[PDB]
Swiss-Prot record, chain A:
Its cofactor is Mg(2+). This is Dethiobiotin synthetase BioD. Substrate binds at K38, P39, V40, Q41, T42, G145, T146, L147, N148. Its EC number is 6.3.3.3. It is an enzyme of class 6 (ligase). It comes from Mycobacterium tuberculosis (strain ATCC 25618 / H37Rv).
Amino acid sequence: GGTILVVTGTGTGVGKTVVCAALASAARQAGIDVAVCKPVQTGTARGDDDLAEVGRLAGVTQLAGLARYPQPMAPAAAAEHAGMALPARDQIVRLIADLDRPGRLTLVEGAGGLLVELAEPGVTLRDVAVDVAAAALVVVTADLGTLNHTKLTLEALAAQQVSCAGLVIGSWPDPPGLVAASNRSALARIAMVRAALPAGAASLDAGDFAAMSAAAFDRNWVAGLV
Amino acid sequence: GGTILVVTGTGTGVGKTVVCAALASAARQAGIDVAVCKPVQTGTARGDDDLAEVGRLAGVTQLAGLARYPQPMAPAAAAEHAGMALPARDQIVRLIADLDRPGRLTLVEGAGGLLVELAEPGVTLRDVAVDVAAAALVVVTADLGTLNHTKLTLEALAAQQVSCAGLVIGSWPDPPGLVAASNRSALARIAMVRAALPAGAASLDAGDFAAMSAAAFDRNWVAGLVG
Ligand SMILES: Nc1ccn([C@H]2C[C@H](O)[C@@H](CNC(=O)CC[C@H](NC(=O)C[C@@H]3CCC[C@H]3C(=O)c3ccc(CC(=O)O)cc3)C(=O)O)O2)c(=O)n1
């Protein structure tokens, strides 16, 4: 196999998709083959489609999903409202394992935070990460409350022996502010801050996004991933 | 002693202060003596003062603070900004131990969520709860993300064998949309939902707040909290 990272977050709306896209873009520019798996996508009635954003921003073509629910809710609720079950644990684990190959970086994008139910019955991205022996990249904010949410998420990871690959600040404000700047330092005391993506990077075109992403991560860290 | 409950939350801004006041008011109307303490209060330069709001909303007079810092930030950062130190672990424990008394419900209001550092080094309200043998009441929202944050918080309580006294939904909208209604039902499968306080409760006057508080909790649960 190659390298599988689950990409999780401390909460909903932290910008996991732009982080997946930026790491994919950075890894591709280092000559690494990248695949991204989003097993479950909700919010499709209003056009939510995180895999398409990854394709547009980073140029990834190996983009795998299993299930799409119209309502903008947690997967289990969205599945309930549609009258259909979530995918089964075996579907997710084997899809990811079949994506994995030597020399490839495979990113698994969850929905919301680490412990939200993604598959039947009550299986989370954490469970998935155990099954495929993935490490976790944790997307965080720079806002008030991020320290508690980050610590909580890293404790949950450690409790099932899922390694933390580091943190990414999904949206770095401009200008920062006292809280954001304090939080960036405090976050780096609990884990490695791999990148802080500028606020608004999601709206960039592919060329600008590729330039941002190349600058955003440490080149040796990206290259060492695989 | 009596019964000590730490009142924590899944994040900042979930309404811990109103839940403290509501539970205090309900316990007082059942004849239970109540004290509330706030070991760390930040944002005092903004006028933040949770103890004084609990006193205003519930009439509680047995109010105990310890550390106060001006900037509206996490305690560690607020203390550093002021050139001050965080309290030591044993200082928070002494603040609480001095209030504990048979027949009294002592509420310990955290700052932000459960793993916020309240004392050097990296001492949290979870450690305090172990020290004083307290159970934890967890204030949650009904919003997107609450299920993950609630499960993360309960898992962290279990890791130190801190019992969970239940959840309180800090603000319950009227009417509830689909997300809020789904979350309430899912929260109730994670842990006992003790109350769900109507949104805007902090703007009720003394009498309305008292009535809301009495209606919001199961009288048997409240009465059962303290012998
Ligand atoms: N039923 C109901 C229910 C609710 N209400 C009303 C009551 C109220 O008016 C409001 C609910 N209350 C609010 O919103 C507080 C406003 C908010 N206050 C904070 O955030 C916490 C402090 C403020 C500055 C520092 C922060 C900190 O303590 C902190 C601690 C740890 C960390 C570490 C980490 O990073 O984790 C970071 C920060 C803000 O200032 O933004 O609704 C109602 O009426 N009826």
